[PDB]
Symmetry: D2
Subunit: 333 residues, 4 copies
């Protein structure tokens, strides 16, 4: 007969708490909280990696092409968002520890830090954080052996951003000899602008959308991440989100943005707590601490920044290329 404790391998989970304070003969009560909090964070990182890798594989094995798999994809990405939302709230627990009580066992941690969280790095990589865009103080130095391996894989293997890019490139309606969404959009913006103080600034920005080369330049830097075609596909799904075939894809784009918002919210709630815990003192990891973590709360680490930025290029309803009754029929189930 299967038993709860055996099923859950609690013989491992609940025998994994060793206070260094106690091991060096000066047991500090709050060190137990510090350990349990990190462990719970790490269990949830594992669940997020389990969800994220199953979704990467659904794109990578071509299953995403079968639209009956979209409910699964959006449920699993929504589940990632719900977990991250709990991980943002979970800082509330560690904030019941005073800086003063933390200061009593802090010495016994050196030089260990969150910089040595394999799962946190795997998570960043698998979503599509680029190493060349990371702020310094580098990242992978902390790791060695069978772990530095897994990290290299996570960097080399296809990211969620790349798989979503590939899928967005294949979006119905972009075909120049098909619905020709882009051609019609350039025309409608160009006309609508002419049919008009302020108009000169928005004229500039809107028509910038149609500059492949500029996009390629901003891309070459890393101020954009998606191919120019992927961006068209995304904008197609935004404007035609009510068309049956675009409903759940739109939900997916929304959830990809949610995961960026919640990852940055996690970075900021971490920062707000570390300020109270250390002030201006440096982290046991070696970094300036507070000031480095503040730098990670930027669009540098927003993988799906393109999806946020498309809100720049929103236009009146009237201008969106009307859906030809035959194209309507292609976008029905």
């Amino acid at each position: 007969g299967l038993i709860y404790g055996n099923y859950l391998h609690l013989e491992k989970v609940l025998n994994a708490q060793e206070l260094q304070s106690e091991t060096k003969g000066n047991k500090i009560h709050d060190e137990h909280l510090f350990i349990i909090t990190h462990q719970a964070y790490e269990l949830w990182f594992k669940q997020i990696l389990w969800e994220l890798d199953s979704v990467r594989e659904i794109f990578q094995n071509g299953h995403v092409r079968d639209e009956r798999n979209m409910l699964k994809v959006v449920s699993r990405m929504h589940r990632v968002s719900v977990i991250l939302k709990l991980l943002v709230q979970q800082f509330s627990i560690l904030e019941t520890m005073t800086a003063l009580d933390f200061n009593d066992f802090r010495e016994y941690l050196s030089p260990a830090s969150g910089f040595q969280s394999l799962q946190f790095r795997l998570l960043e990589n698998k979503i599509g954080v680029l190493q060349n865009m990371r702020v310094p103080y580098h990242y992978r130095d902390n790791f060695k052996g069978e772990e530095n391996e897994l990290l290299l894989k996570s960097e080399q293997e296809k990211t969620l951003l790349e798989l979503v890019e590939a899928w967005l490139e294949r979006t119905p309606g972009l075909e120049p000899h098909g619905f020709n969404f882009w051609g019609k959009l350039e025309k409608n913006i160009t006309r609508g602008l002419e049919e008009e103080a302020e108009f000169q600034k928005q004229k500039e920005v809107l028509l910038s959308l149609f500059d492949e080369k500029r996009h390629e330049h901003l891309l070459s830097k890393g101020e954009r991440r998606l191919s120019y075609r992927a961006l068209q596909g995304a904008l197609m799904i935004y404007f035609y989100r009510e068309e049956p075939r675009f409903q759940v894809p739109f939900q997916l784009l929304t959830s990809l943005m949610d995961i960026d918002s919640l990852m940055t919210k996690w970075r900021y709630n971490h920062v707000c707590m570390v300020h109270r815990m250390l002030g201006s003192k440096a982290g046991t990891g070696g970094s300036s601490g507070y000031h480095y973590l503040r730098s990670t709360v930027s669009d540098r680490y927003k993988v799906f920044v393109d999806l946020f930025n498309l809100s720049t290029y929103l236009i009146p309803r009237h201008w969106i290329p009307k859906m030809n009754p035959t194209i309507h029929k292609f976008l029905e189930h």
Copy 2:
């Protein structure tokens, strides 16, 4: 140098995930969520027992008598309420699993259940849920589901002093109860008798009138029953009250005089104890709401049944709200008893 992974024993924590569906050649994706969810609850149960045991020990070793330890007692009990709040919110994650997807792996779990969580039972016992008062499941004692060391650890948890018992003892020594001192109880009965008489005269001064006489007689009946020590002892034996009559007086002394400096942090403690009771019951209810959607309408009925005042250990602290009186009826503190508390 100490390394993150080794410090946290992640070689144990992150190698503790075995899908029974995969072990039996039919891996079901959502079983991984089911496993991590329970493991996270159990880590947090372990943290709660760590705080709860530290606080029990502070009461038991007589350290709580030194009022410098009150900040630490109330910080740890508040921290238990903050963890319990997260554990209530944590059901949101397992609710992303459909009943249909749960149905694809639940056969591989049988006959294991949350009924076998050692830590959940330790937590219930250490707060002070009485064996006497538990709803029986399948006509049997909760402790049957446990054998060997786990069974003994649970006996110890039932027999050792509970949070309820240690708070009770501390409440009994609340300053001000001394008959030959401030004599809170004697003075309180006198002021309540006067308050009621003055109230009766204001009313005895219409349809609005005959209602207030019935209501007045209700509030009269209730307030005066507070001084009936035999009614109280009787409700004790029937487990409908949990604290001794004297502990109850101590709690009411803290409620009424909470702004007195020596009673400020003690009042926060009594608030945190009600907080833990309320959050344990919200845990039991959110569990129920989820199980309903997973299994349909029996387990679901025993669970709905744990969502009751039988499992509210500090039910007496809530029910004191029954006996609140106008501020101006509360016995005045003279400059000699103020001094003791200031």
Copy 3:
């Protein structure tokens, strides 16, 4: 000149709506201000919920729901209602920063006013589909005038339950000369059970053989009772079920075939309706836990026993979509679900 923030939001009304009765009667009590603001915030959100719910009711009433382009709008708004209800459950945390002792200093100035007099809460219960007969003995005589008028309209106009029921009855696949979901489901469950019993009978007499017989007979009784329409009609009339027999079949079709593109957002909608029932009952339970600390076993200013009556509202008697939850009772092995064939795959 330009629209100003304060004028746009009519803050001249919103922030001039706070009158402490304690102060009006010459004994200002600080925490009364919190009591007022908390209730006003709840009522703004009730008005928002009614705005979303009325809009979704209309999309069903006018047949716009028949155009499946409108399903993202329907699910987004129903989801939005559950996000708001989540905040309103959390919002009790604010009023619990008020001690029972401080509440006791201004409580007297409230009576005989009570939450029973919340028009919007009653409008919300009625519009979702809380039935008059299945309300706890100890509602509408607390009201009069247009208010009493608006409540009657809310009792007679088509509820979300009735509108979802009608829509579930048109679910594709139920057609006896089409996919014939119900015929094939009965056939597959009957066959699946017959085979499960041969599997059990074939075993040599044992302890776990008899437990399996006992378990088989319970499973068989539950699953076959799904196909007993007279039972369903009997349970409708006792208020134990709410959805028509055919709407139940449509719901189970959406459950089983939820991954089929035409069923993906309908499944999200059914999930949302269960979310709203769960959050409404959580609202009632968080309300009960607070009122217990505030009043104990004292009677409410509105007449009721208080804590005891409020506890009675926390039952499946108030779950409008009970039937959506209880379809979990009738889940079956994946292999028993009638197969979709390249013609019915394409229709969906």
Copy 4:
């Protein structure tokens, strides 16, 4: 007899929703959500100001001197943090509005902006945000969206004693600072000087390794920082640069309360200092949650109020807006427990109730 709707003036609260989209004959459904969300924020701002003004008044009228009132002070400041926590979560509601749908009624709002929220500025000012704390754009434009009585309230919110000023005054009176008494600051400098000397000796005694010279330069970093605590001229210099806000003596009060938090008379005061930090953290989380949403709603597009939008709001997510920034930065100056000046039986009894 009193009736619910009348008690709460719902004839005002629920007759305050006017969609501009509908007024200009193009009703947009999601505009209702936009209005109700702002109105709920403005009710809770009003409640926060009610709690805040009541705690300011307890300091200003001297009632805070009587330690009976400390439970009430901490309960109401904790209440403010519980409200702010709901207000941070409340953004999740308005995030169920897509940028696409927002774009359909946005045009009808211009040039109105949250920038024009009287109550938000009253809240900033009464906590104690100073003109020089505010980012150039904020400082320039914020006062000049207001006239008449609204202008007068803004001025009052700046002229009258802020929570920062009233807490500073109270911290200056913290028992144990008096040189003739416990002489906290003198004893602390002596124990830290002695403690650093013992540490230098421990480090110098180690065998001339690489790790040792890492301890040496790390010690010399920690020594400069700790001993800089006792340089009052440096404090006044960081005050001028607005990197610190509290008086040197208020800072000594705060650190006294921190180290001796378990002494009965410092238990609730320590809870107050924690609550003031919580309020600063939740105010900045409110600003950051606002930013994350405004990014999805506008992208790089400028706001209706006149600002760059995303980039201006992002610039308010800064410690220059943290009023009690000094209470956080005291963590820089934590020392081993054994260096904290020992409590004598006489001052112990002084810090009992």
